[PDB]
Design a protein around this ligand. Sequence first.
Ligand SMILES: COc1ccccc1O
Length: 162
Amino acid sequence: MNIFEMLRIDEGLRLKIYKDTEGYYTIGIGHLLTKSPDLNAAKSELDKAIGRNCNGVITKDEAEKLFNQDVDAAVRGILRNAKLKPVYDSLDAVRRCAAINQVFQMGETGVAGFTNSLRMLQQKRWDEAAVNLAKSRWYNQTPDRAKRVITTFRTGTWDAYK
Ligand SMILES: COc1ccccc1O
């Protein structure tokens, strides 16, 4: 297991524009296209992202290309974030994947409500962190996925990903 296999399990792979768990136009391996309810806006974003007229459909290679970019940008975003970087740097590699997964799903603005969890993670108070992590809109809206990511934060193992 590594971050790609992990997020591939959590995000799935769909080659045509679909709506994510939040109802937002998405394609590929959790590549968010837009929050706009306008499908034409999403199709425009898609063509922009891929560099050709896709008419709402891409290939597996193109999905994986966006996925590579998206994972990379999540990591680079964490590293530029004054609040996230020291926590992330304190973590071992497996728990770092949990952090990337969370940011990938919810963005940095999302992981901002997680001040208390972040402190507990930095302190390596793993069971406390895991309890705090689950007290969230995140967990309640996507509980099976959040349980996997939280187990990853709690144990630093890939147990939840089989
Ligand atoms: C709350 O989990 C994180 C820890 C460190 C960096 C990013 C995170 O989402």
